[PDB]
């Protein structure tokens, strides 16, 4: 890992269970806050 | 002021078992734990046991050993010409509040 | 992972104050309680000052107590040791080392070690 990120100071942070010839899908809308 | 007390040299020929006395009193190791560092020369010392017993990641397992009553000892086997280092036996206090330090014990292959 | 850079190593002449600021890197800062401990050439290590993660000092050695202030910014993700009123015996090696606890004084192991900086303090 740590490929992506380089320096963060972080805010929310949340961890649970993984996500998931198959076929994933996702919708990601983000209203409101 | 209470003072850890390692020896202030160490040599044995190779594959013997080696021993390391850090000895103090009780407010110093007969009440709390002990860890043991190694430093070799131009290097920042680092972690090779704590809780008395137990090794970090990586921790030489020919080097360990554990002792009770006031003293605190380190038992090393397999001496490679590499492991000539210096061991620091580090502790807490609880009276007088401020961690302790061994004085150094330097280890030599014959 | 862990890299703990140094600073404000030089020589400082017999009088004057100086600034040890040690800085961190890959690990979250205001968890773990912070160190500083020196080491004199040819001589073993001598704890000189602690800290914890609300900044709330633990005490200095006793040879140093009233001249050294350490302090820490976890949002700088900083660690700095404001020498005053240097002498012959404070030239040292100075390790920013760490502790994996936040209290720091129920017997710790101070498991990541900076490479240190070299205060001389010479004419
Ligand atoms: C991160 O740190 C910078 C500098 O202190 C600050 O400007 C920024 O608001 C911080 N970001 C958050 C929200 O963690």
């Known amino acids: 890992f740590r490929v992506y990120s380089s320096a963060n100071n972080c805010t929310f942070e949340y961890v649970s269970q993984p996500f998931l010839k198959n076929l994933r899908e996702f919708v990601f809308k983000n209203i409101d806050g | 002021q209470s003072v850890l007390t390692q020896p202030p040299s160490v040599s044995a020929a190779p594959g013997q078992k080696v021993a390391i006395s850090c000895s103090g009193s009780?407010?110093?190791?007969?009440?709390?734990?002990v860890s043991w560092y190694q430093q070799f020369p131009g290097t920042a010392p680092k972690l090779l046991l704590y809780?008395?017993?137990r090794r970090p990641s990586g921790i030489p397992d020919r080097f360990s050993g554990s002792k009770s009553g006031t003293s605190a000892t380190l038992g090393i086997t397999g001496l490679q010409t590499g492991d000539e280092a210096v061991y620091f036996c580090?502790?807490?206090?609880?009276?007088?509040?401020?961690?302790?330090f061994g004085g150094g014990t330097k280890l030599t292959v014959l | 992972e862990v890299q703990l850079v140094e600073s404000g190593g030089g020589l400082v002449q017999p009088g004057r104050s100086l600034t040890l600021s040690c800085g961190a890197s890959?690990?979250?800062?205001?968890?773990?309680?912070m160190h500083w401990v020196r080491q004199a050439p040819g001589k073993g290590l001598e704890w000189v000052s602690g800290?914890?993660?609300?900044?709330?000092?633990?005490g200095y050695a006793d040879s140093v107590k009233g001249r050294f202030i350490i302090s820490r910014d976890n949002a700088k993700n900083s660690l700095y040791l404001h020498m005053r009123s240097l002498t012959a015996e404070d030239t040292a090696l100075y390790y920013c080392?760490?502790?994996?606890?936040?209290?720091?004084?129920?017997?710790?192991?101070?498991?990541?070690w900076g490479q240190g900086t070299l205060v001389t303090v010479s004419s």
């Open positions: 580090s502790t807490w206090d609880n009276s007088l509040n401020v961690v302790l």
């Open positions: 800290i914890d993660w609300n900044s709330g000092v633990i």
């Open positions: 009780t407010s110093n190791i007969g009440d709390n734990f």
């Open positions: 080392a760490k502790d994996v606890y936040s209290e720091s004084g129920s017997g710790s192991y101070y498991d990541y």
């Open positions: 890959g690990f979250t800062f205001e968890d773990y309680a």
């Open positions: 809780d008395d017993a």
